Symmetry: C3
Subunit: 438 residues, 3 copies
């Protein structure tokens, strides 16, 4: 720690999870509007039609960010709000919303960090195959260029896509996220076109202005096993390849992990130039971390011969996810050594617990404890030399947690969905203190 | 200095010294209401009936704290305001006041740090023997548990008692503070029941919720001598034992200092189990420091054979207290090595000088200089590895300085008692700068 | 970097460059009011009659400082506004303006840092010879004492004069700044009387109160050559002596550089006591840096045998000034070794570029880049042990850039002179981020 070093504190959200106004302001439907209408797809039949009504309440939320003292707000632009047909005319009303949001953040001293793709693909493009269609990578790059042309006079730090693991595998192989497809080959195609879209968008953004910075957000789930057999060690290697190296290796090493390619037995649809584009240099890696996975070998499992294990006697959040902050330190060290990103921003970390409103307040000590321990673990890595330049808490506010719906609350600020009232939780006051006093 | 380390800047007050409204809002009398009615007990016949009228003016005072930029407000709860009879019924109007104060601080981003006992024992309990009565330790612990039950949803860092040296020795041996008693055995009893109350309250607070942190505040007065004789060196040891080790050794070593016990020749009323309670582990030590004492041997002095000396040719405050910041560094190092508290917060440090209002302003360069030098001395200890986690300036505002009355002004903000106007002094602007720029 | 170390972030302006109200509020004319009426003296015939109208709009400018988050505001007092006759009666209306400015800054948590002389000598004193007249040093010291008597209850950190290189050589030898004289002996006389005025004023300020701190602001222009001949190396020494050592050596070494004295062939008008006064100890050096100069030997040049060279293929600002941040680091190290000031404040650093307003906003990436690189270079020196205690950006707002007029914009905030609207530039948002996150 020397004179001149900086560190950025932020909060993170995404468009479909908070905005609402799903059928207002000219917005066209996304794959999540469609998916959340399918009986059984989302807990309690929840959807994002209203969410946190942030489309109308953004000034209140920006005021809460200023009150917390964050220097940065990591948010996503809803592609179907700004280009409802996916590829074609801009929706001026949608662009004006993001102008008002950005200008309001800047007036309050907050730097907006936009993510271009946080899972809300326009249904108009899914009707053409979505991410299974190679053209979707190019449609995304054109949308990205239009956003940079409109907003990069003010916004200098961009993220292309968020968590391709979820969009590709959960959305096209396991079918538990939109668009709900269940096919390995489609998942492989989608993974390649998400990554190609990232690379094409990066190049397009840089053509707008050479001062702009660009990265990608990857979630990493470190894998362990409780067994000692050679096959259980193989299970760890397979899970790590499927979750992590499948996406990190193309970006930083210009190739897919050969052990996983071989185990799939399928071809990735790589065309000339693709791997050069996907591996284009980035200004930073956005890293998301929540938990580690415990696995064991299972010869009957598909597409790869391993299964998840629920380890006994470990601390778990309201999601059932293991709490293990030491894995965060070790992951940060591993990524820095293995992939050597120029710098790292924690674009998401946080936890969900059963919250109760008592006397108009929300006391959430389990969320405070998770936050304290994960900030400590992150700084332990920074003190070892890992170039972590900022931390963005997921999330500012409780919101639509995808297939879990509204029942799973990640906010440091509580949202009463009956009234839309925001109530800062104990974790908000803790985070506010950490921002000021570090 | 490494990534993740934090430091807390605060200001400190106490309830009887600032609140006023002594016979309003359901408050019952304290031993200081009674003591201040006795001619000769307090300079100028001053009392705390009105003080700074903070009970009515707290919003203005919170606004001044936000303007200073402090992250923390160290305050005390008036036991006789919330439980006028000492044990038994809660006074709703008093509890509501502290709720409003706490909620107002949090709205402004300020963490309230409550002290449960800052010398205003309910007169109803003094009528039953006060701290001479072992039951007072249990009455205090029950009061503490009720406060944690009411406020610990928001308040996570607690202090039990403040400066038992003053309550025990000055209040029961020298009779210069309330309740004005002058008896060595009573002072010994009171010291044990204050410390036992601390331990019982700590255990009771932790039973409310396991996330809560608890400490005690001790003032330390380092002792030196100008002489070279062996008896003058003994005088230093005795004065150090009387002022400092008598209270620190029970808390951190589970025993009273044997040399002082022997010199007193009296029994401490220790019941089996008491020392384990008194020495229960703490999250932090609150340390108060203002000055060092100079002593010499005096065979005629009681209860111990030493006397205070007024060393010649040294800088002194308006209290007549020596200014010697290097002693602060050495004290912090000594406490850290001898008692090994997990962390230390400076809960009080400051100085009093004759202030003059000129053109509606107060320029107080001697207070600025004391503050600068003592902050430098504190950071010198931190740079040697002492875990000092925060500094709270005594005081936000001029107030009732106990037996000195209002004539002695410790505020960084001046109070005109005729109008209750608050005027920030030069020291307020200096402290505001230090909070921002360190 | 250790615990307790502080760093001050500021912005800088000067009175004639921003205030306007040149013939209002009792102000008398300065030498710049006169000079800017001379055809050909100032680009576009610009003058400071209106400037940024800060005399009326200071509340808005102070609000912008608070919004940026600076802790300090470096400004100058207009001698002809407060004493229109130069020596004699105070203009109460002018003094009241500075009271309002100072009190407004303090209400916002901003420490004002006054410069007493930033080039706007009263014309009433120029009519008596200005800085050519030795009495001007004493007139300046009397003015300085009156300002300290009025304002030092609040203002503790003073600067006497700013950039005597400009007032002496550009104003009296080259005639490109007011008062427009072109005579070497007059320039020598002026340089000595400026420096004597600095010393006399320092002594007078300290007589007002011993807590007050005083420094001087010097601009340094490091010199290099592209040639290898011994005569080109001599050119570097001459340029360094003329620009830098002529003013630094009297202040820190109590003598004028003998090589330059010999080359001028003229006597400096040194009287008994002068060099002791000029070299009086200072609490800090205010350092101004913008660029390095490239020179070569030229036997025909006067007063010294060197000329400026425009080095090929280097980055340059809108002023034509080379951008070379590494020279800033090396200058700071050299000053610390050569002159050993107790501490250094960067009282000015910044850059000018042609700005364009697009959609009501100003995106100035070249100014951002200069700022980023010069802050990095400054902190590189601090990390080597140079005692740089703060940085003041020139300037908060676009203003009257002397003989260049309004066409040259140094602000991080744009001023539309038709409307007086202030528009924060991208560089303002960058500086705001750096202040918060370092």
């Amino acid at each position: 720690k020397k004179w001149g070093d900086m560190f950025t504190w932020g909060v993170s959200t995404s468009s479909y999870q908070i905005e609402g106004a799903a059928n207002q302001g000219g917005r066209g439907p996304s794959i999540w509007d469609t998916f959340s209408k399918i009986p059984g797809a989302v807990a309690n039949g929840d959807n994002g039609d209203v969410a946190c009504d942030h489309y109308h309440r953004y000034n209140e939320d920006l005021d809460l960010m200023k009150w917390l003292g964050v220097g940065a707000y990591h948010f996503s632009i809803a592609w179907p709000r700004v280009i409802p047909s996916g590829y074609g005319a801009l929706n001026k009303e949608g662009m004006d919303f993001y102008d008002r949001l950005i200008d309001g953040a800047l007036e309050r001293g907050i730097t907006p960090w936009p993510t271009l793709y946080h899972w809300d693909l326009p249904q108009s493009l899914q009707d053409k195959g979505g991410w299974n269609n190679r053209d979707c990578a190019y449609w995304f790059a054109e949308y990205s260029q239009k956003m940079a042309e409109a907003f990069s006079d003010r916004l200098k730090n961009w993220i292309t896509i968020n968590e391709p693991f979820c969009s590709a595998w959960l959305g096209h192989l396991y079918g538990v996220m939109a668009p709900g497809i269940k096919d390995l080959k489609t998942g492989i195609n989608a993974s390649h076109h998400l990554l190609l879209g990232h690379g094409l968008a990066t190049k397009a953004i840089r053509e707008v202005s050479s001062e702009l910075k660009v990265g990608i957000t990857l979630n990493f789930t470190p894998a362990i096993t409780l067994g000692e057999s050679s096959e259980d060690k193989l299970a760890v290697e397979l899970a790590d390849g499927f979750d992590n190296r499948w996406f990190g290796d193309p970006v930083f090493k210009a190739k897919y992990p050969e052990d996983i390619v071989k185990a799939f037995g399928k071809e990735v649809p790589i065309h000339p130039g693709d791997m050069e584009i996907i591996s284009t240099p980035l200004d930073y890696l956005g890293l998301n971390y929540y938990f580690r996975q415990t696995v064991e070998y299972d010869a009957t499992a598909k597409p790869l011969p391993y299964k998840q294990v629920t380890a006994p006697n470990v601390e778990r959040t309201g999601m059932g996810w293991e709490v293990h902050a030491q894995s965060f330190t070790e992951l940060l060290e591993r990524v820095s050594k293995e992939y050597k990103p120029k710098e790292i921003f924690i674009t998401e970390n946080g936890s969900a617990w059963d919250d109760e409103v008592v006397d108009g307040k929300v006391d959430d000590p389990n969320r405070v404890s998770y936050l304290e321990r994960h900030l400590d673990a992150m700084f332990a890595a920074k003190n070892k030399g890992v170039p972590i330049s900022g931390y963005f808490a997921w999330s500012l506010i409780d919101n639509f947690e995808w297939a879990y719906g509204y029942a799973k609350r990640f906010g440091i600020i509580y949202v009463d969905y009956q009234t839309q009232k925001r109530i800062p939780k104990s974790s908000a006051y803790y985070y506010q203190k950490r921002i000021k006093e570090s």
